[PDB]
Write a protein that binds this ligand. Structure first.
Ligand SMILES: CN(C)c1cccc(CNC[C@@H](O)[C@H](Cc2ccccc2)NC(=O)[C@]2(Cc3ccccc3)CN(Cc3ccccc3)C(=O)N2)c1
Length: 379
């Protein structure tokens, strides 16, 4: 089994807070496009018309291999949204498996709050399941095609490395690269195949139990969403967390705006009080009954840095009313294996992740935890 995917390493790029994107080509002859990696969607879409924030776009009238499904679609994201027209064509990935598949594509015609000014990416690649792909579960997701058409194993992995400018990372399609991680890879079930829904069964700031019915952690749902930057937590759990964390940082106090993400804090050139902020652990239902493991992050993960002679940061842990959302603040610390074949997800320490001389992210296990499946939300 190949364990060194030389071609696919460092294949991802990103501009902090604006996401990680890969290079892809569509139409024939090929037209290059910087697509954005998003494990929290299922529509493959691209800028298909001129627009001020787009440096370039896909022109269906220049691809001989083009083809039009004669149907329109649009998708509402948390804040922005786009309206496109569906079709097909040949898609490739210059730094991915040397295959060339036919996928579905929404040519984006009209968009509001979707493209970001100078974000350098022109489209999105929803890597999630068909269950939530507009117009409906019929529009076969791109990764599903890449799979049925070629021989790339049904599974991909992601290494997102933040920074302390220009974030990088690896997207290994169809395999796991042994060099991207250290130690042991722990898996957690994928509750339901719509989003990448997992389950948290215990949370703790600086090793101290938050102590809530593990149902509040998954109130609505919990998902791994690379397409989201912040660690989003339910209403109740968010407050609990900020109080605890707040307690642990008390050496210095910060304006209510900070903990609400409205304001950003700074310190003299590289004199960040890293060691006052606590570590955060999420316990995820393990594979073996009554057995679970935990992933712990650092301030270097949840205090996303922001562009004088100071180092300013934005608190990256925020509230949510749509379940828990393990975004980038989480992921940027691990090597996450989205093993679709076996309905699961692995977590191992990320070999490129930012951490200081004294503390490092981690993944440890096992822990004999009882009544875990009850931590899940039923409706
Ligand atoms: C379609 N569907 C089933 C669905 C509907 C609603 C919610 C979700 C959950 N998935 C969300 C991600 O798929 C989606 C990916 C995206 C990125 C950039 C622009 C537009 C969309 N993220 C957000 O909407 C934002 C929503 C958001 C906007 C502003 C403040 C907080 C959150 C974008 N923002 C920052 C970001 C910008 C650029 C690149 C990467 C991340 C986030 O962290 N999340 C899925």
């Amino acid at each position: 089994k190949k364990g060194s995917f030389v071609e696919m390493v460092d294949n991802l790029r990103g501009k902090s807070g604006q996401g990680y994107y890969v290079e892809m080509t569509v139409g024939s002859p090929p037209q290059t496009l910087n697509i954005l990696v998003d494990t929290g969607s299922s529509n493959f879409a691209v800028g298909a018309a001129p627009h001020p924030f787009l440096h370039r776009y896909y022109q269906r009238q220049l691809s001989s291999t083009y083809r039009d499904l004669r149907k329109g679609v649009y998708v509402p994201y948390t804040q922005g949204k786009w309206e496109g027209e569906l079709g097909t064509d040949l898609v490739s990935i210059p730094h991915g498996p040397n295959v060339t598949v036919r996928a579905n594509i929404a040519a984006i015609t009209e968009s509001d709050k979707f493209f970001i000014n100078g974000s350098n990416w022109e489209g999105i690649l929803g890597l999630a399941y068909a269950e939530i792909a507009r117009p409906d579960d019929s529009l076969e997701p791109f990764f599903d095609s890449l799979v049925k058409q070629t021989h790339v194993p049904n599974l991909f992995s992601l290494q997102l490395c933040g920074a302390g400018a220009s974030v990088g990372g690896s997207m290994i399609i169809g395999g796991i690269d042994h060099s991207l991680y250290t130690g042991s890879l722990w898996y957690t079930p994928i509750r339901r195949e719509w989003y990448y829904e997992v389950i948290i069964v215990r949370v703790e700031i600086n090793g101290q139990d938050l102590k809530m019915d593990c149902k509040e952690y998954n109130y609505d749902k919990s998902i791994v969403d690379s397409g989201t930057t912040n660690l989003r937590l339910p209403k109740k759990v968010f407050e609990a967390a900020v109080k605890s964390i707040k307690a642990a940082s008390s050496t210095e106090k910060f304006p209510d705006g900070f903990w609400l993400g409205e304001q950003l804090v700074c310190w003299q050139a590289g004199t960040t009080p890293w060691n006052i902020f606590p570590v955060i652990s999420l316990y995820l239902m393990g594979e073996v009954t009554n057995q679970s493991f935990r992933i712990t992050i650092l301030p270097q993960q949840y205090l996303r840095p922001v562009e004088s002679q100071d180092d300013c940061y934005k608190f990256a842990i925020s509230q949510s009313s749509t379940g828990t959302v393990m975004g980038a603040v989480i992921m940027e610390g691990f090597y996450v294996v989205f093993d679709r074949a076996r309905k699961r997800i692995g977590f191992a320490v990320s070999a490129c992740h930012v951490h200081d001389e004294f503390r490092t992210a981690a993944v440890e296990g096992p822990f004999v935890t009882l009544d875990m499946e009850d931590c899940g939300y039923n409706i």
